[PDB]
Amino acid sequence: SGFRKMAFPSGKVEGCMVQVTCGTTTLNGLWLDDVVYCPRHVICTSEDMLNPNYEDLLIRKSNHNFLVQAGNVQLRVIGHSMQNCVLKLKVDTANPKTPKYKFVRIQPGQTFSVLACYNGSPSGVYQCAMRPNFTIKGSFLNGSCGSVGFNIDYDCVSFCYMHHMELPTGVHAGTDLEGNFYGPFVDRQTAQAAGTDTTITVNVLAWLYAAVINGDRWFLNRFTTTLNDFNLVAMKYNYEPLTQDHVDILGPLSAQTGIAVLDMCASLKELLQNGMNGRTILGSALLEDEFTPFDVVRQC
Amino acid sequence: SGFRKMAFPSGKVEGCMVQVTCGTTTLNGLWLDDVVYCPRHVICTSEDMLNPNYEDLLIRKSNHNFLVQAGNVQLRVIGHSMQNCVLKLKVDTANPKTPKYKFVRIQPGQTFSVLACYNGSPSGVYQCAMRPNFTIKGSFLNGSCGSVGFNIDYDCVSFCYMHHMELPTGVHAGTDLEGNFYGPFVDRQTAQAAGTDTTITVNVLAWLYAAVINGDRWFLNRFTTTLNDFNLVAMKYNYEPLTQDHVDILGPLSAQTGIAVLDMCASLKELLQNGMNGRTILGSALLEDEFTPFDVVRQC
Numbered sequence A, B: 001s002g003f004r005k006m007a008f009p010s011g012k013v014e015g016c017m018v019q020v021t022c023g024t025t026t027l028n029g030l031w032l033d034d035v036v037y038c039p040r041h042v043i044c045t046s047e048d049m050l051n052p053n054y055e056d057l058l059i060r061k062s063n064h065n066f067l068v069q070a071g072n073v074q075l076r077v078i079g080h081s082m083q084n085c086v087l088k089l090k091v092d093t094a095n096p097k098t099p100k101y102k103f104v105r106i107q108p109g110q111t112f113s114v115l116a117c118y119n120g121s122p123s124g125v126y127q128c129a130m131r132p133n134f135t136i137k138g139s140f141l142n143g144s145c146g147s148v149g150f151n152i153d154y155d156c157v158s159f160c161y162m163h164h165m166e167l168p169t170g171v172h173a174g175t176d177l178e179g180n181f182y183g184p185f186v187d188r189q190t191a192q193a194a195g196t197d198t199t200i201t202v203n204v205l206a207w208l209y210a211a212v213i214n215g216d217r218w219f220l221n222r223f224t225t226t227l228n229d230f231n232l233v234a235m236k237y238n239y240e241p242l243t244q245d246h247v248d249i250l251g252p253l254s255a256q257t258g259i260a261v262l263d264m265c266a267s268l269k270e271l272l273q274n275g276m277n278g279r280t281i282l283g284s285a286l287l288e289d290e291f292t293p294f295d296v297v298r299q300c
């Protein structure tokens, strides 16, 4: 019983975290088969990061300027390529510990586990959600780049995120494992905006559902409302609009608890209009939107 | 940049999680060398759990009534012993993946990572704090028992917690790895109270310090106060008393930030007396006490 932000077990992923060094810059890479993936700004000096031409910078680099370390062992780089914002260093030895894996591009509102790494060594695990503005709210210091975000589905690690950047607001931006950024970000030391952060309404409603399943029911109201009317009030509060697909996703949760989605949307509406009056739901004095319906079900 | 509840990487611990079955009861065990550790109520039926005599129950059991599974492989139980509330099943094969490890008894206010397991298979990782009333606020369903709590210090896994029980309030109680409960709990299906839950004041102050380091400063006040006067107001709010050792622990954090402990205690005092006025610190509308000073430093 109880509900907590949980991350996937990190073991399969720890075995793929290497250290990549190019000159004075050192970052984490991800060693799957005979290929190492890291952020391409590893090939940058502090001067270059202001206005980098990555084709030109890399053309200057040769396989031997890239140091890949796995614990103590040194991998021999026999190839180098640039896919979008990601450098692919081909190496001699396939990773014996390559787990079964896939590269996925998650959509906004979905969550993933992050293994935060410094120097190719894991330091800690936490769960993040792709915000709607394509940022994440993590714990990344300098050296965390190349740290990866993943889901574990059965035996298969779905890699979805590699960390590249912190924004001026302190949020974090990164790419998929094909090197395409989430959001309108570029790997350059320039001022960049994520824009208006909005609340994943479907997740807040899964969370309210987790609360009811764990015994918190005070927020429940006898009123009900309409989808469009809920969305009318929601958009005022920069809440992402609910859809009938959203409703179908919350379906097995509205079933389990005997509370209809439109009944919950009315109870959420009162909480947005009337505040929380100093109470707490599931130990939070604010509304949580970093759990998906799937997250809640897997826990409950 | 940023502050998040982080758990240790779980890889060394995943490799020690086995499944223990005795009759119709199945639980998780922890396989270190030629010894498996699990909660002893594995030897109980649903009738026995009401008023169990564990000596008598186990005397009826023989090595062959205990099924230990590691993935598919079956370990052969060649020994059985009861240490406090923990059953030690001696086995034939030493665990090849035994990490370097130690058994520690944590003190209240300290935090640890939990790997939550079902059927000897890991499902997720989160960070917990030993509450002052010796309970924990986790996410444990039936079958989670024998799931373990740990810290990773250098190369060495310090096992500190094994889960046994949920209380009527929904909090969780368990033992150290020598089988001694944290708190006044017994492994019996009876109504049991943890008592008054109090707030780890030293942790809240480390958290306020993490907030300042990450840029949240609004709560900071020009006032200051005295230790004893702070403790006067604190005890009203069921906050654990601060001590000069506590102060020395928060020392490197009061140094880094240029704010004295007694200056922070005054700023905490205003927040207890004047509320938070609807603002947020580090994304929370409540005061967080599940980070120790060490946790904050390791992250920052």
Ligand SMILES: *[C@H](O)[C@H](Cc1ccc[nH]c1=O)NC(=O)[C@H](CC(C)C)NC(=O)c1cc2ccccc2[nH]1
Residues within 6 Å of the ligand: A027, A041, A044, A049, A140, A141, A142, A143, A144, A145, A146, A163, A164, A165, A166, A167, A168, A186, A187, A188, A189, A190, A191, B001
């Ligand atoms: C990668 O290791 C590092 C991640 C990092 C750095 C500092 C704090 N937190 C972190 O997570 N990422 C960077 O250093 C990147 C470098 C590449 C070329 C994008 N740059 C920044 O993160 C950065 C640059 C910048 C300019 C102005 C405001 C903020 C800002 N952040």
Ligand SMILES: *[C@H](O)[C@H](Cc1ccc[nH]c1=O)NC(=O)[C@H](CC(C)C)NC(=O)c1cc2ccccc2[nH]1
Residues within 6 Å of the ligand: A001, B027, B041, B044, B049, B140, B141, B142, B143, B144, B145, B146, B163, B164, B165, B166, B167, B168, B186, B187, B188, B189, B190, B191
């Ligand atoms: C161990 O797998 C299981 C853990 C569990 C069970 C249900 C919900 N959440 C959980 O974490 N622990 C138990 O089943 C134990 C059994 C032993 C003998 C202690 N019992 C309880 O957890 C329990 C018994 C009881 C009686 C009255 C109120 C509450 C209560 N909880």
